[PDB]
Amino acid sequence: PGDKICIGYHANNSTTQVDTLLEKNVTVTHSVELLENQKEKRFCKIMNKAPLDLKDCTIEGWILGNPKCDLLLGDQSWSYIVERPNAQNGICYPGVLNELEELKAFIGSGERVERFEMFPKSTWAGVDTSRGVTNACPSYTIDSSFYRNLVWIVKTDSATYPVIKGTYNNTGTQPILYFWGVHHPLDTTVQDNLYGSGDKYVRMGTESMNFAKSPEIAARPAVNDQRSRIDYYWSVLRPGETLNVESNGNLIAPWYAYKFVSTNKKGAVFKSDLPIENCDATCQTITGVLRTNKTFQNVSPLWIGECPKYVKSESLRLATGLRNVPQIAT
Amino acid sequence: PGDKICIGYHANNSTTQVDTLLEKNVTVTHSVELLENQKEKRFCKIMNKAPLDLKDCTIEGWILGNPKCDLLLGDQSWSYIVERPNAQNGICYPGVLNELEELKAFIGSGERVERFEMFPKSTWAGVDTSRGVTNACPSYTIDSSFYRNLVWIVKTDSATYPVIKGTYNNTGTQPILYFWGVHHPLDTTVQDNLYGSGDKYVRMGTESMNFAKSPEIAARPAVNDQRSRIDYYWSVLRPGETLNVESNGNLIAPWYAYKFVSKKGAVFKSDLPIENCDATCQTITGVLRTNKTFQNVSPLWIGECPKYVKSESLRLATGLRNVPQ
Amino acid sequence: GDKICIGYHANNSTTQVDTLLEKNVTVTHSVELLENQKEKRFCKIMNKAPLDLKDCTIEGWILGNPKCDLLLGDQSWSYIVERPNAQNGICYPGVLNELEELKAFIGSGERVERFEMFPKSTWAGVDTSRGVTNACPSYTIDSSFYRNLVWIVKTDSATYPVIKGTYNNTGTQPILYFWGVHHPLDTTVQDNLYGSGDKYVRMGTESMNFAKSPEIAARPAVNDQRSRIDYYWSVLRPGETLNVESNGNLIAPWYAYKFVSKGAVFKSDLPIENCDATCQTITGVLRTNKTFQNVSPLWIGECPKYVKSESLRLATGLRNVPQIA
Amino acid sequence: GIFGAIAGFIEGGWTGMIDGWYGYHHENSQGSGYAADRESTQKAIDGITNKVNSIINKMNTQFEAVDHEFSNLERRIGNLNKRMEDGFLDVWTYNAELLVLLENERTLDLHDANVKNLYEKVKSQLRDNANDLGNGCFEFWHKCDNECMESVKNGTYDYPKYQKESKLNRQG
Amino acid sequence: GIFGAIAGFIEGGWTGMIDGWYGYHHENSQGSGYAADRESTQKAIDGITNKVNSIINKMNTQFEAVDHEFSNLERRIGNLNKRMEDGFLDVWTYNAELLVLLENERTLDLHDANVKNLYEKVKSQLRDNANDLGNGCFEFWHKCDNECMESVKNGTYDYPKYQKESKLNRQGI
Amino acid sequence: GIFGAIAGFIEGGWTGMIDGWYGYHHENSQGSGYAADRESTQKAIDGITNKVNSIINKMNTQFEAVDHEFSNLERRIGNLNKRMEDGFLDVWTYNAELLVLLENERTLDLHDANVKNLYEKVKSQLRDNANDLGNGCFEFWHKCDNECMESVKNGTYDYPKYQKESKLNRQGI
Numbered sequence A: 001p002g003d004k005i006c007i008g009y010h011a012n013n014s015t016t017q018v019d020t021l022l023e024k025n026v027t028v029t030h031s032v033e034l035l036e037n038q039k040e041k042r043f044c045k046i047m048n049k050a051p052l053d054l055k056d057c058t059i060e061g062w063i064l065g066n067p068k069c070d071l072l073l074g075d076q077s078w079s080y081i082v083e084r085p086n087a088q089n090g091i092c093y094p095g096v097l098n099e100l101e102e103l104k105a106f107i108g109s110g111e112r113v114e115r116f117e118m119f120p121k122s123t124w125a126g127v128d129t130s131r132g133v134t135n136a137c138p139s140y141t142i143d144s145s146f147y148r149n150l151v152w153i154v155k156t157d158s159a160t161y162p163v164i165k166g167t168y169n170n171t172g173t174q175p176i177l178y179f180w181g182v183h184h185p186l187d188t189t190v191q192d193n194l195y196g197s198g199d200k201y202v203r204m205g206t207e208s209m210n211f212a213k214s215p216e217i218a219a220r221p222a223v224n225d226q227r228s229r230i231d232y233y234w235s236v237l238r239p240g241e242t243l244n245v246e247s248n249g250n251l252i253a254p255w256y257a258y259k260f261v262s263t264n265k266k267g268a269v270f271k272s273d274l275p276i277e278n279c280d281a282t283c284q285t286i287t288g289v290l291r292t293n294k295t296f297q298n299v300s301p302l303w304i305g306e307c308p309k310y311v312k313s314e315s316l317r318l319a320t321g322l323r324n325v326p327q328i329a330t
Numbered sequence B: 001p002g003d004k005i006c007i008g009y010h011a012n013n014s015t016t017q018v019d020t021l022l023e024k025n026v027t028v029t030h031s032v033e034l035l036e037n038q039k040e041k042r043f044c045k046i047m048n049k050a051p052l053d054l055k056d057c058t059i060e061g062w063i064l065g066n067p068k069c070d071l072l073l074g075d076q077s078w079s080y081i082v083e084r085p086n087a088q089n090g091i092c093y094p095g096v097l098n099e100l101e102e103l104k105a106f107i108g109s110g111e112r113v114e115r116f117e118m119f120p121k122s123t124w125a126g127v128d129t130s131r132g133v134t135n136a137c138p139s140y141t142i143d144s145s146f147y148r149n150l151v152w153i154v155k156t157d158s159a160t161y162p163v164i165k166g167t168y169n170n171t172g173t174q175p176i177l178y179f180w181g182v183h184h185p186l187d188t189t190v191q192d193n194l195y196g197s198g199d200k201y202v203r204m205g206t207e208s209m210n211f212a213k214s215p216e217i218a219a220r221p222a223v224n225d226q227r228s229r230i231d232y233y234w235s236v237l238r239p240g241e242t243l244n245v246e247s248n249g250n251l252i253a254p255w256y257a258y259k260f261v262s263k264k265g266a267v268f269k270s271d272l273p274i275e276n277c278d279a280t281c282q283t284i285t286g287v288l289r290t291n292k293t294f295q296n297v298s299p300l301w302i303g304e305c306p307k308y309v310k311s312e313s314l315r316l317a318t319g320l321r322n323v324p325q
Numbered sequence C: 001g002d003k004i005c006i007g008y009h010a011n012n013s014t015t016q017v018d019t020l021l022e023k024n025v026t027v028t029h030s031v032e033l034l035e036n037q038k039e040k041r042f043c044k045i046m047n048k049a050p051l052d053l054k055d056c057t058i059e060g061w062i063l064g065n066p067k068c069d070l071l072l073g074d075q076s077w078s079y080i081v082e083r084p085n086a087q088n089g090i091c092y093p094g095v096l097n098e099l100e101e102l103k104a105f106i107g108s109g110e111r112v113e114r115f116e117m118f119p120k121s122t123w124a125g126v127d128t129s130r131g132v133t134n135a136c137p138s139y140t141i142d143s144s145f146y147r148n149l150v151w152i153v154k155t156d157s158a159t160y161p162v163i164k165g166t167y168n169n170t171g172t173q174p175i176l177y178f179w180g181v182h183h184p185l186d187t188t189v190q191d192n193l194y195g196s197g198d199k200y201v202r203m204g205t206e207s208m209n210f211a212k213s214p215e216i217a218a219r220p221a222v223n224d225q226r227s228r229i230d231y232y233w234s235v236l237r238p239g240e241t242l243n244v245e246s247n248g249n250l251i252a253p254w255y256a257y258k259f260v261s262k263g264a265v266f267k268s269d270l271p272i273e274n275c276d277a278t279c280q281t282i283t284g285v286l287r288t289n290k291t292f293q294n295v296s297p298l299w300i301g302e303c304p305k306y307v308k309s310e311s312l313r314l315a316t317g318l319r320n321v322p323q324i325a
Numbered sequence D: 001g002i003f004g005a006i007a008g009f010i011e012g013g014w015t016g017m018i019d020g021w022y023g024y025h026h027e028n029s030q031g032s033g034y035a036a037d038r039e040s041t042q043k044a045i046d047g048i049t050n051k052v053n054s055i056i057n058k059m060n061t062q063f064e065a066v067d068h069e070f071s072n073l074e075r076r077i078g079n080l081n082k083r084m085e086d087g088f089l090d091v092w093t094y095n096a097e098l099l100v101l102l103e104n105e106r107t108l109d110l111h112d113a114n115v116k117n118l119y120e121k122v123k124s125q126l127r128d129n130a131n132d133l134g135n136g137c138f139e140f141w142h143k144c145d146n147e148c149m150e151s152v153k154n155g156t157y158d159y160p161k162y163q164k165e166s167k168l169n170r171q172g
Numbered sequence E, F: 001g002i003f004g005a006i007a008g009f010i011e012g013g014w015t016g017m018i019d020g021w022y023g024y025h026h027e028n029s030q031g032s033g034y035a036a037d038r039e040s041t042q043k044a045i046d047g048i049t050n051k052v053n054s055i056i057n058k059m060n061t062q063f064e065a066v067d068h069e070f071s072n073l074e075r076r077i078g079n080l081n082k083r084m085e086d087g088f089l090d091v092w093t094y095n096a097e098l099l100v101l102l103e104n105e106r107t108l109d110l111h112d113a114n115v116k117n118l119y120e121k122v123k124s125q126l127r128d129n130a131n132d133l134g135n136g137c138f139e140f141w142h143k144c145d146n147e148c149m150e151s152v153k154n155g156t157y158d159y160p161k162y163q164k165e166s167k168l169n170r171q172g173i
């Protein structure tokens, strides 16, 4: 028999396939999957910061201080916000929170708020602070209450609701996020009973801002057994800025407000029913945690943290070895 | 002298060329054009569904019910809308149709409307509902008419204009698209003659919407002989929602409204003909009937069209370099 | 015996490219496609100078802050340069409504032509000469006003009557104009300057309506003022007419601009020099034939494509393997 | 060419070879003619077909322009929409045109390789029973039959069968 | 494949060659075995690794979609956001999927090339001192012991050293 | 390199060949030299120039970012603009960087292929009338004239003309 030398290549037991422009389903000896399709179906901490669980409250219910939202009442620090799709506690006294979307965007930008009394009830003189509660807004204990951050001001027994004024000067280095309202009664009779007779107004100003509104009296379809409405409003009092409040009547006054810190993170507001657990993540998507070193992911385009690039692909397997052509054994 | 066997490749009569990174104008034996540059210059049905030809009416003229737009009036269903660029029948009494662009976008999303009487004239008590016509809004048969979907409510010959009220509860399955207006007289003389003396308001509300407006009296420049204006409004009454109306004067009442049914919507602004033709891909500049992957016709289309690119030609070599002898 | 060998070129090049397979490959020839170098100045574009707003913002310029008088006439520009620390803007505190749209509309122009739209005589039986404030000094007068507005006040003895004005744009160019509404701090200032009673400002054209009345209240002091002015702008189209009607609190349009006609507004401290450019970015002039650039995505003129890359060097030559000497 | 066969050492193509991309030209006492190599031709067709369908499939999405209306207070968002739509237009236009130039270069190279590998397949069959002329042609040192020509085309050429006849002439 | 070696004139691979991608199989009186060509395999490993890391690096940005709410008067800008995000999703899906199909074609060709060049390298050393058996195998016309085999693999094969012997045997057959 | 010639079986390049990319080196009793093959060089220059221009042409579009301001009630659209602009920037940066890496790989392979094909052109002309030294060099078994050298270079080498001289020299050795 003659001595032989042969030139050839590696084969192995790989059954893993790739596609090329010229050919589909090519089995190759070595390959790398570049795409991640696995997730943990939960929310974890990012930057070791817990997310804020709004529970049975919406974002509106939370920062207006819906009485049923007292669990969240106060001081809050977060890496992102989780809002449950069927949270029941939002705007309890019917009406519009004006520029809502842009409020939700601003809140998302923040990383922490500190609640504080902005205008003490004493600020308003000659008017009744105490009577402003409604059955539309119960707490979990009292059937007639009102948002923690607002005072519904009423005229006192005297016929007159006087001009009231309030000033807050922001000396603090942090912007303040604050709210107020204007109350629209269903009828002239309720308007007379609650507030003075005659033309009413709510006027507010800062160095950079103006606001004027008067009541728009009409009967509206009942919501929470109410045919009257409140126009809710929000604003941000910059560091160094001063707020002037002046009202003839129909004012839902700012009471408590929030010192606001913006963040260097994204941040996010995830509307989801997934559980929050005591875990850590590098990449949190709205449908779950990715815990991966892959380049691409097909889980979700919406995330916070460092995630792989989102694509619609099912798989992105790069060949690294060669065509696998093992010997046929019988 | 010896026998021979030679190895070689196909050649042919092709004068069709491709470009590569290395070389332009390479004649190749077989190739495929991936780009479509031809079109039928007309409008065709899409899913066997005719488009809506607005003819001499703009979108505003149509859904406010301009009297000259009567051909349009009633139920409609469509695969896309054709508005003619020179259409002359729109807002006939001068004024602004508030949030117009957003109205045009909502109407575009739709496939069909059903016109119905939302508020009978009898709804409003103690006022005149028969006199709200104007020489700025003629029909083809009368010199002084008004929008068919609105009622311009005026004082009864014996004063005054009382508080009027109306409610409508959407019990149905479908969202309702409706319209109203606020009249803004040029004078206090027109104000007092049409409506009372006194401060007038127009207020409307639903579970989720609040509206309040009062008249703004001043003379604007004459348009269709009118120095008065109407502010027009639209909204959408969701299923389950109730509308409350309340006015003191200056209300242009909702009369008729549309059950609205909502893919890809298209409003094509074009003068091209609508023909008794069927199609799968409709472009604003015409039909593409084609199997190709790319098209250089238009980025604006409805149906399943090829991808729009600015390329002249996208020819892929399939065969090889053609070198005939 | 005699040799023939086949081979390839080498040279003393030490310039490298990267490859999908291999980094730092020395090649005999190559082309850098990216420009990373800039002249740190602003130059003319199309042999046309930019408008330096200097110590004025766009508001100060176009409203005619008294300290912005250097900029008072016709201006033609290729682009606008606004210095970041410019201190002359809105001197009497208040909001310039739709400010961002005004800045984009101005950025799309290339020329304005200033002209008196409403002579002071337009408004009868009021005082047009006392409308000045210590909030708006010129460099020589401690109390002045915007050059483009008149702050009308009631006459010394008489009540404030209904004033009216019309301007008919019989020209071929759109007109950019301005007005305002004064919101006094007190009912006392209100009654002093204007009549007793409800006041309004109303304006309209064929296509636009405006109505506003004073919102009286004390706001935090700004340049010593607790009152406010609401400023507004609009564009009177060729053929359009503007009607103005008010019984008080009107800050009237005086001077306006015929507006002519990619535009750019650069906020920057770079100097404008006697030079020409074909590509101007916000951080400097590109003088290059390269395909890409990493200087800035913000530019005017014809610039190469912006990318974040440090270098895009294309091998044209072969791998360089010179003999070891 | 990159593999150097097409418009290379095989200077031209064959209008006469009608039924294939790559193939054989023979000459012998019984005649001359053309025959496509069926296996390599079909494999190239399969490959090129797959390439065309992959490209078509990847290009199957569309960016849709809308032509919404924008008011005289919406210059910014109107412009945002325009630049947005023009931007995706420029990316897809670039993607399509660049891909066609690149793929066209590679497809011509593939055809060139298939021709070269066919030439080497024959070459290694024939060994020294034939002279490799410069031009993809082989001149036999023995009489090659139509049956002989067929076996060369089938990969079943019998070198020992003609070795001694070939040695004789190759030296004689 | 494009260089025609893999699944080509060399019909199958070797499960027995476990230390490399490309290699030699030898048989002689001393024995038989498999051995990878270390130099060509290691260069292929470096190159393919660089390719993978390059692709990963160029793909290391992410378009970001956002949670923002839009009101019922914001249909146009809401659709604008949607068409924008989907637009970049479609561009990046296309980029990644096309790149993988393309690079997979070229990586298989690169391997095909390294096998063919290894074959040609041996072929040009052995000349007519060996006989082509087909399937990338040569039978020597002389005794080729382990040091001879190694010299073929090393690129240091001595054709003069064996030319007399191989010429004599070529005659004998 | 993928065709194995450059920095491969032809270990180095020639600083002395200054008139072309690819060339012949000869030595004979009349002297020695380095001379470019002009046709292959010029064809390669034309192709590469075309590649560069095509890329420049394809890249000559510009996405344009803008100077627009947004208010404190326009955070959503302001961010939409920023994500849009960053999005196209990332897409184009990717397109340019990947294209450069990919085309540099393929350009180096094209040079390697042209060298390889030149080498094969000579080897098939010379047959057994010359001895393959390594490094892409052939030693003639016959006296090879300047005129003979030109005939190898322009593809007109007359193998039979020197076959007898060659064989006589070959095995005398």
Ligand SMILES: CC(=O)N[C@H]1[C@H]([C@H](O)[C@H](O)CO)O[C@@](O[C@@H]2[C@@H](O)[C@H](O)O[C@H](CO)[C@@H]2O)(C(=O)O)C[C@@H]1O
Residues within 6 Å of the ligand: A131, A132, A133, A134, A135, A136, A144, A152, A154, A185, A186, A190, A194, A225, A226, A228
């Ligand atoms: C601050 C105040 O006056 N609160 C009242 C409240 C408001 O006056 C009212 O919501 C504005 O219209 O009204 C309350 O009484 C309600 C009645 O107005 C209504 O007819 O029916 C309700 C239950 O069906 C309720 O009785 C309220 O909302 O609780 C009483 C409250 O002290």
Ligand SMILES: *[C@@H]1O[C@H](CO)[C@@H](O)[C@H](O)[C@H]1NC(C)=O
Residues within 6 Å of the ligand: A017, A018, A019, A024, A025, A026
């Ligand atoms: C392999 O083939 C199956 C069907 O033939 C297909 O679903 C799969 O995508 C192919 N594998 C890939 C893509 O590697």
Ligand SMILES: *[C@@H]1O[C@H](CO)[C@@H](O)[C@H](O)[C@H]1NC(C)=O
Residues within 6 Å of the ligand: B013
């Ligand atoms: C080209 O070839 C096709 C098919 O062979 C033939 O039908 C056609 O007549 C030819 N075209 C010319 C040159 O007229």
Ligand SMILES: *[C@@H]1O[C@H](CO)[C@@H](O)[C@H](O)[C@H]1NC(C)=O
Residues within 6 Å of the ligand: A221, A222, B169, B171, B240, B242
């Ligand atoms: C509207 O109709 C539904 C069902 O008929 C009814 O339950 C609801 O009370 C009505 N809404 C109002 C408040 O009129």
Ligand SMILES: *[C@@H]1O[C@H](CO)[C@@H](O)[C@H](O)[C@H]1NC(C)=O
Residues within 6 Å of the ligand: A169, A170, A171, A240, A242, C220, C221
């Ligand atoms: C806010 O506080 C600073 C510091 O006391 C003060 O100078 C400023 O006047 C205040 N603003 C007003 C309007 O008082």
